[model samples]
Target: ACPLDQAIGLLVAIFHKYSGREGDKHTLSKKELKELIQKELTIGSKLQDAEIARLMEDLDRNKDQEVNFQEYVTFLGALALIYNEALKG
Candidate 1:
């Protein structure tokens, strides 16, 4: 597979890895998202609890208590832009 294809597949798989743990097999609960971020991202370790809570609130665009795949993807897109900016510097 192409590099981009592989990256997308891995991202989708990672979401399910956490999202399937408890309530709502398809959407991520707050605890699940926390684990995902802390385990999967480098910046996760530096983020405080309040920051994570704020991120959750921002990502839940539909005001749902949980984050579904589309919402998660949107979060990734925003992160990608941040990464892109960092790369240029």
Candidate 2:
């Protein structure tokens, strides 16, 4: 697969790996989301509770208290924008 395709596939795979841990097998609970961030991202270790709280609030667009695939993808999109800025710097 191409690099971008591989990245997209990996993102989907990682989401399923965490989202299936408990509760709804398709969506991520707050705990699951936290674990995913801490385990997967470099910024995770630096994130405080206040930051995590804000991130959750931002991601849960449907106000369901859970992050579905769409919400998770939105997060990825935002993350990509941050990366884009970093690359430009």
Candidate 3:
């Protein structure tokens, strides 16, 4: 597969690796999401406690209390923007 195709599949698979650890394999709870970010994402290690909290709030659009796949997609886009900037440097 092409790089993009692999990346897309990789993201989907990675989401499950984290989300499937606890409740609701189809969605990510707060703890699961935090661990996923801290472990898998470059930007996550740099985030402060307050920043992580704020980002969590933003990602939970429905306020139903969890990061669903749709929300993860949005978070992924935002991360891509940061990655773009990092790549430019």
lDDT tens digits by residue: candidate 3, 25-45: 999998898888888988788
Per-model CA lDDT versus the true structure: 0.93, 0.93, 0.89
Question: For candidate 2, which ten residues in a row score worst on lDDT?
Answer: 49-58
Ranked by TM-score, top first: 1, 2, 3
- How does each model score on TM-score? 0.95, 0.93, 0.88
C-alpha RMSD of each candidate structure in angstroms: 0.8, 1.0, 1.4
Q: What is the lDDT of residue 43 in candidate 3?
A: 76
Error of 2 at 76 (Å): 0.4
> Candidate 1 residues 1-89, lDDT tens each?
99999999999999999999999999999999999988999887789999988988888899888999999999999999999999999
lDDT by residue for model 2 over 1-89, one digit each (tens)? Answer: 99999989999999999999999999999999998988899887689988988888789998898999999999999999999999999
- Give the clashing residue pairs of candidate 2, or none: none
| TM-score for candidate 3, residues paired by index | 0.88
What local lDDT does model 1 show for residue 85?
Answer: 100
Report the backbone clash tally of model 2.
0
Better of 1 and 2 by TM-score: 1
